[PDB]
Structures are given as structure tokens and as C-alpha cells.
Design a protein around this ligand. Structure first.
Ligand SMILES: *[C@@H]1O[C@H](CO)[C@@H](O[C@@H]2O[C@H](CO)[C@@H](O[C@@H]3O[C@H](CO[C@H]4O[C@H](CO)[C@@H](O)[C@H](O[C@H]5O[C@H](CO)[C@@H](O)[C@H](O)[C@@H]5O)[C@@H]4O)[C@@H](O)[C@H](O[C@H]4O[C@H](CO)[C@@H](O)[C@H](O)[C@@H]4O)[C@@H]3O)[C@H](O)[C@H]2NC(C)=O)[C@H](O)[C@H]1NC(C)=O
Ligand SMILES: *[C@@H]1O[C@H](CO)[C@@H](O[C@@H]2O[C@H](CO)[C@@H](O)[C@H](O)[C@H]2NC(C)=O)[C@H](O)[C@H]1NC(C)=O
Ligand SMILES: *[C@@H]1O[C@H](CO)[C@@H](O[C@@H]2O[C@H](CO)[C@@H](O)[C@H](O)[C@H]2NC(C)=O)[C@H](O)[C@H]1NC(C)=O
Ligand SMILES: *[C@@H]1O[C@H](CO)[C@@H](O[C@@H]2O[C@H](CO)[C@@H](O)[C@H](O)[C@H]2NC(C)=O)[C@H](O)[C@H]1NC(C)=O
Ligand SMILES: *[C@@H]1O[C@H](CO)[C@@H](O[C@@H]2O[C@H](CO)[C@@H](O)[C@H](O)[C@H]2NC(C)=O)[C@H](O)[C@H]1NC(C)=O
Ligand SMILES: *[C@@H]1O[C@H](CO)[C@@H](O[C@@H]2O[C@H](CO)[C@@H](O)[C@H](O)[C@H]2NC(C)=O)[C@H](O)[C@H]1NC(C)=O
Ligand SMILES: *[C@@H]1O[C@H](CO)[C@@H](O)[C@H](O)[C@H]1NC(C)=O
Ligand SMILES: *[C@@H]1O[C@H](CO)[C@@H](O)[C@H](O)[C@H]1NC(C)=O
Ligand SMILES: *[C@@H]1O[C@H](CO)[C@@H](O)[C@H](O)[C@H]1NC(C)=O
Ligand SMILES: *[C@@H]1O[C@H](CO)[C@@H](O)[C@H](O)[C@H]1NC(C)=O
Ligand SMILES: *[C@@H]1O[C@H](CO)[C@@H](O)[C@H](O)[C@H]1NC(C)=O
Ligand SMILES: *[C@@H]1O[C@H](CO)[C@@H](O)[C@H](O)[C@H]1NC(C)=O
Ligand SMILES: *[C@@H]1O[C@H](CO)[C@@H](O)[C@H](O)[C@H]1NC(C)=O
Ligand SMILES: *[C@@H]1O[C@H](CO)[C@@H](O)[C@H](O)[C@H]1NC(C)=O
Ligand SMILES: *[C@@H]1O[C@H](CO)[C@@H](O)[C@H](O)[C@H]1NC(C)=O
Ligand SMILES: *[C@@H]1O[C@H](CO)[C@@H](O)[C@H](O)[C@H]1NC(C)=O
Lengths: 122, 431, 122, 122, 42
């Protein structure tokens, strides 16, 4: 056990076994200021959980999806990503490709929603 | 390779936010506007860049210390009736405390609107301005009315912890040679800061936190003479206050339920209020300051300490509060030396009762007399110097801006915004 | 792409392929006005997510359920519902029976929640 | 139908028929008093949903786990728990064993999260 | 016919920044802002 953000400097493979530690800490003059800090924490948490549900990843911490990895985003191989890079370094590399990936996941699930809707119709 | 989304990554950006107070007889910075406290996690291999000079906690703490000051003065007496004409005579009519006082007699309102009250009080010469037993008036009477410093609230600073809200973290630089800027090899995530006492003072950082290994010199741009230099000591220099007089506070009923506390009589030791700093301890502390100050200007340069240049009494003197009564010490014997490559120092201090504290105009405060003898024990844990624009560098004491006082306590802290959503390549493929 | 509420005039069959568009737009003196509207948007969103949870439809946009259609709520066949009417026209038709169906969906899930629960005990 | 908390005195077996009755009732300067009570209910509800989500129980009123029942918590047989005790009596008996159970459920899910994530790449 | 036929040149005692001192001042007030009390008194 490392603690909150303990694996920030750890490799992506090693830091992915402690996702629960960071996940559980995202939810919980000194009056309204302290009260609006709690409402901001809930709204920030709820819009992240909404994104997971839209991508079909609701209730999951590691969600393998159907969107293929465009090599333009990152040409590195798996060995030097999950064993040589940390999540802070990785976020810097793909910070500009984040929004195009988000749209790809959003539409891919929307296609899967109608694909399973038609399969159940038979 | 495919994009995989990780939620909860340890990634943070610099951010400005509203940190909430926390603390562990009412106070100016009371616990009724704060939260009970409860911690520190060492972030290995993390090298963050701090900047104590563009830190928003310093700017927010200045706003909050002011805000708690005004909030603590609204519910108590406003001295509008104290703008009358004063018939003031000397107290001594001849070096003492009594040469600093005027014995002022005036007509005051009674608790009944139609009745007056011939009363008198001893006002410091720094609070009365002559009108042309002469005729005087209180000094802050053409600018504002002085809300009386409420007698049941204490000016003693209690430690306050500034704690970050959810989604934010406070990064603490644990480096012991960290000046104020650049990378910090040792960083930690604290839930929130150590107890920062909001000690209000000028030219000297009374009480507070010491340096760890050696005197630290901290300037935004050491080559710019317009920037204050925040010296931080490693061993505190103890300074002892006093007002030897046995004051006699007197109560005047200026209205229904409102009382005005006045100096009725002064007896006892009438030596001028003063502060004592050990001459041996101060000399070796300036020796450490000079040693750490030649590193930025040269080994062969001449470091000379002069006294304050000029301006307001709040900026030319070591203004501070001690025992509820506000002192203004000369500190011209502290800063008087030239450095080439049991005894004590007595600093004569004046006292005022009408205080314009936060360098503002239009909001004064009347500090009521403190009954008895006032005694004082503080630690000088730092300095605020200004440099003069040749092989000789002259360092005069500085101040005025109260933010440099709390910039010396919040230099090691930094607020970051957690960015928990990050994408990265992996051999995954959604099924 | 049509946009938010763009398929309001589209038939029910065509407007059900754009549910992600409307779903993601339900979440995002004079300071409480801004703040109290945000809290009401979060509360309303959670009420509809709670209803989907107790119907067994959590994390789904199209959720086929076990509740039969009575034909006393609408006698129209599938051809004239999913290819002629729009979701606004349909809403004005079963508004009377909305709370009748909302009770049947909750009751069916609760019975289904235990029938599956009792099945795992074998 | 007994109503909200109607089965409070029923046995643990009979009280489990009506978990949806209590579940739906947990969610719904004088304005601030009402407004702060609303925010407290929302964040209190979300912390319970978050706990279920990290145990792999999101969207389920009854969830089966992979944590064996250590007899130290309670050695009473299954027949004298679901037909003799009420839920209020049970909560007082395992009150001190609650937190250690909560950690085991969290450790059981993220073990299944990674094992299924690993097996899914084969 | 002029603007000056719409104005009254009103003189009054006003308080000073010191409570015990008065201030004999004057101002031009529009006739629409002053009501007579019965150099008249308005
Ligand atoms: C500095 O100067 C001050 C005066 O400004 C000195 O203070 C006075 O000290 C004398 C003793 O030296 C006190 O006289 C005694 O009174 C006590 C009982 O006093 C009580 O009642 C008083 C009247 O209401 C009250 O003032 C007292 O003090 C309280 O209230 C004041 C505010 O008003 C506050 O400042 C204080 O802190 C107190 O809360 C108190 O309630 C009496 O018992 C004494 O003993 C004599 O009488 C007995 C028999 O009764 C006899 O046996 C003894 O031998 C002795 O003769 C005596 O009458 C006086 O009350 C104090 N006055 C004030 C205003 O406090 C102070 O001592 C000087 N200090 C120095 C450093 O020299
Ligand atoms: C307090 O008020 C009295 C009057 O109520 C002042 O006494 C007057 O002083 C003026 C001179 O300024 C004389 O012309 C009057 O004759 C005095 N009246 C008396 C003595 O009844 C007195 O000066 C005031 N005291 C102050 C302002 O300290
Ligand atoms: C309020 O009155 C004080 C005292 O008269 C004014 O300060 C004086 O200003 C003159 C003119 O510059 C100086 O010569 C005096 O030395 C000042 N006296 C002190 C004690 O500083 C002040 O300017 C007045 N304020 C306003 C707003 O009118
Ligand atoms: C610096 O800290 C010291 C110690 O806390 C302060 O001195 C204390 O002041 C309070 C209130 O006046 C007294 O009750 C204590 O007895 C004092 N302690 C000692 C050892 O004298 C001092 O006032 C502070 N300096 C400031 C605030 O400028
Ligand atoms: C502060 O101390 C200084 C130095 O003691 C005082 O000012 C000077 O004192 C020396 C001798 O002590 C004189 O030769 C100078 O002429 C003084 N300069 C002045 C009076 O401007 C000073 O009086 C003390 N107090 C203040 C408030 O400055
Ligand atoms: C301003 O006040 C003065 C008095 O302070 C007024 O002058 C007085 O007027 C009354 C008539 O109403 C006379 O009986 C007094 O003798 C006057 N006193 C003097 C001249 O010292 C004056 O009228 C006031 N001005 C106004 C109201 O515009
Ligand atoms: C991959 O990204 C490039 C831009 O970086 C883009 O032009 C290309 O269309 C993308 N390929 C796919 C299959 O999305
Ligand atoms: C820092 O790096 C070392 C090796 O370079 C590693 O053993 C250690 O775990 C890292 N720190 C953290 C907090 O993971
Ligand atoms: C009052 O004191 C001042 C300064 O100490 C002095 O100049 C003045 O002459 C004194 N007034 C007297 C003695 O009447
Ligand atoms: C403070 O220290 C850092 C790191 O040693 C250095 O880069 C920076 O220049 C120093 N500050 C000043 C004002 O020189
Ligand atoms: C300061 O020192 C003087 C003698 O140098 C002494 O008389 C006085 O009492 C001292 N005051 C304090 C507060 O230490
Ligand atoms: C200050 O006072 C303390 C006792 O309160 C004494 O021990 C110390 O020597 C004094 N120091 C100075 C510099 O006056
Ligand atoms: C600084 O000292 C000089 C004499 O050394 C004095 O004239 C001047 O008033 C002092 N300035 C202050 C104390 O601000
Ligand atoms: C000054 O600091 C010392 C330790 O450095 C401490 O023991 C003493 O109480 C402090 N004096 C104060 C805060 O008045
Ligand atoms: C349809 O609803 C009616 C009441 O409106 C009810 O009597 C009837 O049983 C329902 N149909 C079925 C098949 O349950
Ligand atoms: C049950 O809990 C006890 C602690 O009360 C522990 O000693 C024992 O090993 C546990 N049984 C297991 C883990 O099978």
C-alpha cells in the first residue's frame, strides 16, 4: 500500500493496480466557501462518471473498449509505455489527442447500443 | 496500439482556488469562521517548481486576515461622539512617558440624549491634532470615525491552517536550501499547512517559523533594489517589550449601552516604552545574515546596515501589537553597522491608540487602554530589508506591505489542481 | 449530426438513434442564482438515473424491459409509432399512463431482482 | 405493501423482499437550511453508491461477493440469521466487523478487475 | 424663458466634518425640488 497518489512516479503498469486509491479520494469565510467546494467536488465527479457511462464503462475502473489505437496518437510500443512511462508523462504526450479519442469512444458505444438493440429484436 | 482511458492518474496542474481555514474568548481571526482540523505524504521522485512571489495563497491570506479583522470590529462601539473639541493641557509641564501625553478635557454625550458629560482623558500626542489649555481634536476625525477596538476580543494571533478543497492538493516543499523559486527536489502532499500565526508587524518578522540549517535570503530579484529581501533566521533573536507605566483604564458612558475606555491616570515607572534585544545575539545574527548576503553581491563588498529612510510611522518603525497595545519601535540601533570583508540594545518605542492598520484610509480603530503593566516576549525570526541603488551595499529595513509577512510563512506551499483523467496507449482493444 | 434536440421533429425510430446527444446536455445575490440552478440540475439528473437503476436500466440508454404493453395505454401498432409519430407527439399520448408504467417497471425489476437472487442460492 | 421501514421488525429474510422501498426514500438563511439538507442527502447517497461500485455491486440491491464469511464476525448458522433476527439486531452484532469486511470486498473486486482484465487479453 | 428662471439660489446651514461646527453654504436648486414653507423659506 502506497497511499493517495503514491504511484504517481511509478510506471503505468504498476500505477494501474492502485486506481482504487485515487478513485475513492475524488468524492470526499468558512461557510459558503466550504459549501461550494463540496458541490464542485460532486459535479466534477459526476461529469467523469457520466463520461464512463456514455462510453459503456460505467461501474468499471479498467474498461477495454473497441476503438482501435490510431498510431498517430502514439507510435510507442506496449513495452515502453507500461514499463517505462508514468501516467503524468503519458498524459503530457496525448493531452491534445484526448478530445478526439473522447469523441471516438462516445460514438463507438452509441453504435454498440443500436447494434445490441437490433440483435435483441430477433 | 490503442487508446485506453485511465481515471485517477496522479497528475496535477497549477491552480488558484479558495482554501478554507482550519483551527485546533473570541478572536479577531476566530474559530467561528474556521473548521476543526484532524496527513503528510512524501512524493518521491517528484520535482515541482515553486514560486513564493506569485503565490495566490499569500494574496488570499491577505484578503482573509483583513476580512476577519473588519468582521470582528463591526459589532462593537463606533466612536462618532469622540469628534468634539478637546481642551488639552500637558501632563508634566517640563524624557518620560508623561511627555508623550496630553490631558484632554471634552464634553461627551450621556446615556440620556439631552444631558452632557464633562469628562477628561489622557491622549497620546500622536492621536491629537491642534486646531488653529489649547484646542485639539483626534487625529482620524477629518478622515473617518474610529470604531473602538472591542474590549472582549483579543488581538493575539492563533494559528490558522489553510486547507485545500476536494479535487485540489497542497504541495509542500521540504527542501532546506529552497530559496523561493525553481525546482524543489523534495515535495510532499499535506492535507493542509502548518499553523500560520498571522502576526502583524513591520521591519521584523516576530514569532513564526525559523530556517532549518542557515539564514535564508529570499528576494524576487536580488539584483533589483525595488524588491524587498525576506531574511529568515535559523536561531531566533529574542526581543523583550515593555510599557513600564501602571495605566488606569477609565470607562465613559457615551450612549445607551456604549462605553468609551479612557486613560484616566498614569502612575508607576514612567520610563518610555522600549524593547530590548541582546547585543551579543543580534551581532552574531547580523554576522550570519551578512555571510549569506555576500553570496549575492561579492566577497569583497561592504555590507552596511542603515536605518529606515522615511515615510509613515507605520513604515519607519517596527510597528507591532503586544499585549493589546500597539508599539512603534525605532530600530535605529538594530540596523547601524558596517561589515568589512549581558549587554542589550534598547529600542525606544512610541504607542498609539488610533490605528489605521492595513495601510488603508477611512477605517481607523481606537485601541482601548490596557490596565496595568504590559510585558512582552517575542522571537525575531526574520527581517524585511530594502537595498539602496560602488563597493558598498546599504540595506535599510523595509515593510509596509503586509503580504511580505505571510509570504515568509507560505513560501514552501503550493496549490495544485488534480487532473485525474488521462489517456495512454496500450495493447487493449474493447470487445 | 443534427445537434441537441435536433431530432425533435424526427420520427420516434429516427430520434432514438440520437439519445447520446440529449443525454450529455442534461448536466452541463446572483451567485446563489447560478449555484442553486446547478444543484437543481444535478438533483434532476440523479432522480432520472435512480429511476433507471430501480428498473434494471442503469447505465443504458435503450433498455428493453419485461413489462408487457397493455394496449390500453396505446392501441397503435409498431409501424405507426416508430415511423409516423415523434417523441413529442408520443409523450402527449401516454402522459396519463406514465406513472402506471413507472410502477410496473419498478415492480417487475424487484421481482426479477429476487428471482435471480434465489437462483444463485442453488 | 408495508411502506417505508415497514419491514424493520420483520426477519432478515422477509425484510429483504422490500429493499427497494427504503432505497427509493434515501434521495427525495431558511433557504440554506433546506438547501444544505438536500446536498447532504445527495453526497450521503453517492458515497453508498460509490462503495457498491468499487465492490462490483453497482446497480444491484442484492449483490453476491467472493469474500468468504469468516466465522469470527459471526458463527451463527444460516438458519438462525435469516429467519430469527431482524436487520437492526444484525447491524449491532457485526458493527465492529463492518470496516474489515468493507476492506475485503474492495480487495476482492480489484483482484477480479485485474484478473478479468488479464484474461480478456488472451 | 431662460434656465435661470427654473432655479432657486438657496442658502442653508450645513454640518461640517466636525460635529460641533456648522457651515453656511448655498446651492442652486431647481424649483421642482424645493417646496415653500409657510429670501423666503423653502
Ligand atoms: C496599579 O494601579 C491600580 C489602580 O489603578 C492598582 O489596583 C488596585 O489595587 C488595590 C490594592 O493595591 C485594590 O484595592 C483592594 O480592593 C480589594 C477588593 O477589590 C475589589 O473591588 C474593587 C472595587 O470594585 C475592584 O476595583 C477590584 O479590582 C477588580 O476590578 C478592576 C476594575 O475596576 C480590575 O482592573 C481588577 O483586575 C479587578 O477585576 C476588586 O474586585 C480589597 O480586598 C483590597 O484589600 C484591602 O482591604 C482589605 C479588607 O477589605 C484588607 O484586609 C487589606 O489589607 C487591604 O487593605 C483592597 O481594598 C484596588 O481594588 C485595585 N483597583 C483596581 C482598579 O483594580 C494596582 O494594584 C496597581 N498595580 C501596581 C503594579 O502597583
Ligand atoms: C463644554 O461645554 C461648555 C458649555 O456647555 C463649554 O463652556 C463654554 O465655553 C465657551 C467658550 O468656548 C464660553 O463662551 C461659555 O460661556 C462656556 N459655558 C459655560 C462655562 O457654561 C466648555 O468649554 C466645554 N468644554 C470643552 C469643549 O472641553
Ligand atoms: C486631516 O487633517 C490632518 C491634520 O491637519 C491633515 O494632515 C496634515 O496635512 C498637512 C498638509 O499636507 C501637513 O502639513 C500636516 O503635517 C499634516 N498633519 C499630519 C498629522 O499628518 C490631513 O491631510 C487631513 N486629511 C484630509 C483628508 O483632509
Ligand atoms: C509571540 O509569541 C509569544 C508567545 O506566545 C507572545 O507572548 C504571549 O502573549 C500572550 C498574550 O499577550 C500571553 O498570554 C503569553 O503569556 C505570552 N507569552 C510569553 C512567553 O510572554 C507574543 O505576544 C507574540 N508576539 C507578538 C504577537 O507580536
Ligand atoms: C530614532 O533614533 C534616531 C537615532 O538615535 C533619532 O534621530 C537622530 O538622532 C541623532 C542622535 O541620536 C541625531 O544626531 C539626529 O539629528 C536625529 N535625527 C532626527 C531627529 O531626524 C530619532 O529621533 C529616533 N526616533 C525617531 C522617531 O526617529
Ligand atoms: C444659519 O444659522 C444662523 C444662526 O446660526 C441663522 O441666523 C439666525 O437667524 C434667526 C432668524 O431665523 C435670527 O433670529 C438669529 O439672530 C440669527 N443668528 C445669527 C445671524 O447669528 C441663519 O438664518 C441660518 N441660515 C439659514 C437657515 O439659511
Ligand atoms: C489518425 O490520426 C490522423 C491525425 O493524427 C488522422 O489524419 C487520421 O485520419 C487518423 N486515423 C484514423 C483511422 O482515425
Ligand atoms: C522513485 O523511483 C525509485 C527508483 O528510481 C522507485 O523505487 C520508487 O518506488 C519511486 N517512488 C515512488 C513513490 O514510487
Ligand atoms: C507642553 O509641552 C510642550 C512639549 O513638551 C512644550 O513645547 C510646551 O511649552 C508645554 N506647555 C507648557 C509648558 O505650558
Ligand atoms: C533561487 O534558487 C533557484 C534554484 O537554485 C535559482 O534558479 C534561482 O535563480 C534563485 N533565485 C534567484 C532570485 O536567483
Ligand atoms: C531593558 O534593559 C534595561 C537596562 O538595559 C532595563 O532597565 C529594562 O528593564 C529592560 N526591559 C526589558 C523589557 O527587558
Ligand atoms: C527577556 O526576558 C526573559 C524573561 O522573560 C529573560 O530570560 C531574557 O534574558 C530577556 N532577554 C532580553 C534580550 O531582554
Ligand atoms: C534614521 O536615523 C537618522 C539618524 O541616524 C534619523 O535622523 C532618522 O530620523 C532615522 N529614520 C527613521 C528612524 O525612520
Ligand atoms: C521563541 O522560540 C523558542 C524556541 O526557538 C521558544 O522556546 C520560545 O517559547 C519562543 N518565544 C516566544 C514564542 O515568545
Ligand atoms: C390493462 O389495464 C386495465 C385497466 O386500465 C386492466 O384492467 C387490465 O388488466 C390491463 N391489462 C392487462 C393485460 O393486465
Ligand atoms: C478471521 O478473523 C480473525 C481475526 O478475528 C483472524 O485471526 C482469522 O485468520 C480470520 N480467518 C480467516 C482469514 O480465514
Amino acid at each position: 500500500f502506497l497511499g493517495f497518489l503514491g504511484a504517481a512516479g511509478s510506471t503505468m503498469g504498476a500505477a494501474s493496480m492502485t486506481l482504487t486509491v485515487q478513485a475513492r479520494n475524488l468524492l470526499s469565510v468558512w461557510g459558503i466557501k466550504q459549501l461550494q467546494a463540496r458541490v464542485l467536488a460532486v459535479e466534477r465527479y459526476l461529469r467523469d462518471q457520466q463520461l464512463l457511462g456514455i462510453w459503456g464503462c460505467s461501474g468499471k475502473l479498467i474498461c477495454c473498449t473497441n476503438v482501435p489505437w490510431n498510431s498517430s496518437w502514439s507510435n510507442r510500443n506496449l513495452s515502453e509505455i507500461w514499463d517505462n512511462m508514468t501516467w503524468l508523462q503519458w498524459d503530457k504526450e496525448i493531452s491534445n489527442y484526448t478530445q478526439i479519442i473522447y469523441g471516438l469512444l462516445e460514438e463507438s458505444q452509441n453504435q454498440q447500443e443500436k447494434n445490441e438493440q437490433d440483435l435483441l429484436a430477433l | 496500439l490503442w487508446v485506453t482511458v485511465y481515471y485517477g492518474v496522479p497528475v496535477w496542474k497549477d491552480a488558484e482556488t479558495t482554501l478554507f481555514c482550519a483551527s485546533d474568548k473570541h478572536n479577531v481571526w476566530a474559530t467561528h469562521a474556521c473548521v476543526p482540523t484532524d496527513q503528510e505524504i512524501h512524493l518521491e521522485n517528484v520535482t515541482e517548481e515553486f514560486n513564493m512571489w506569485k503565490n495566490n495563497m499569500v494574496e488570499q491570506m491577505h484578503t482573509d486576515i483583513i476580512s476577519l479583522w473588519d468582521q470582528s470590529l463591526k459589532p462593537c462601539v463606533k466612536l462618532t461622539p469622540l469628534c468634539v473639541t478637546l481642551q488639552c493641557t500637558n501632563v508634566t509641564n517640563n524624557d518620560d512617558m508623561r511627555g508623550e501625553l496630553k490631558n484632554c478635557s471634552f464634553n461627551m454625550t450621556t446615556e440620556l440624549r439631552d444631558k452632557k458629560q464633562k469628562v477628561y482623558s489622557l491622549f497620546y500626542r500622536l492621536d491629537v491634532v491642534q486646531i488653529n489649555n489649547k484646542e485639539y481634536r483626534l487625529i482620524n476625525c477629518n478622515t473617518s470615525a474610529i470604531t473602538q477596538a472591542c474590549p472582549k476580543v483579543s488581538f493575539e494571533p492563533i494559528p490558522i491552517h489553510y486547507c485545500a478543497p476536494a479535487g485540489f492538493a497542497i504541495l509542500k516543499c521540504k527542501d532546506k536550501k529552497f530559496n523561493g523559486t525553481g525546482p524543489c527536489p523534495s515535495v510532499s502532499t499535506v492535507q493542509c499547512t502548518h499553523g500560520i500565526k498571522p502576526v502583524v508587524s513591520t521591519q521584523l518578522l516576530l514569532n513564526g517559523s525559523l530556517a532549518e540549517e542557515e539564514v535564508m535570503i529570499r528576494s524576487e530579484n536580488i539584483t533589483n533594489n525595488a524588491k524587498n529581501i525576506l531574511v529568515q533566521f535559523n536561531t531566533p533573536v529574542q526581543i523583550n517589550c515593555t510599557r513600564p507605566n501602571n495605566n488606569t483604564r477609565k470607562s465613559i458612558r457615551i450612549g445607551p449601552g456604549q462605553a468609551f475606555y479612557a486613560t484616566g491616570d498614569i502612575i508607576g515607572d514612567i520610563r518610555q516604552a522600549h524593547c530590548n534585544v541582546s547585543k551579543a545575539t543580534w551581532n552574531e545574527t547580523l554576522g550570519k545574515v551578512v555571510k549569506q548576503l555576500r553570496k549575492h553581491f561579492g566577497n569583497n563588498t561592504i555590507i552596511r546596515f542603515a536605518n529606515s529612510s522615511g515615510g509613515d510611522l507605520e513604515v519607519t518603525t517596527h510597528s507591532f501589537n503586544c499585549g493589546g497595545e500597539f508599539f512603534y519601535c525605532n530600530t535605529s540601533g538594530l540596523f547601524n553597522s558596517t561589515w568589512i570583508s549581558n549587554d542589550s540594545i534598547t529600542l525606544p518605542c512610541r504607542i498609539k491608540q488610533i490605528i489605521n492598520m492595513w495601510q488603508r484610509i477611512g477605517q481607523a480603530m481606537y485601541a482601548p487602554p490596557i490596565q496595568g503593566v504590559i510585558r512582552c516576549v517575542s522571537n525575531i525570526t526574520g527581517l524585511i530589508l530594502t537595498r539602496d541603488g560602488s563597493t558598498t551595499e546599504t540595506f535599510r529595513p523595509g515593510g509596509g506591505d503586509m503580504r511580505d509577512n505571510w509570504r515568509s510563512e507560505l513560501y514552501k506551499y503550493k496549490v495544485v489542481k488534480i487532473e485525474p483523467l488521462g489517456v495512454a496507449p496500450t495493447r487493449c482493444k474493447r470487445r
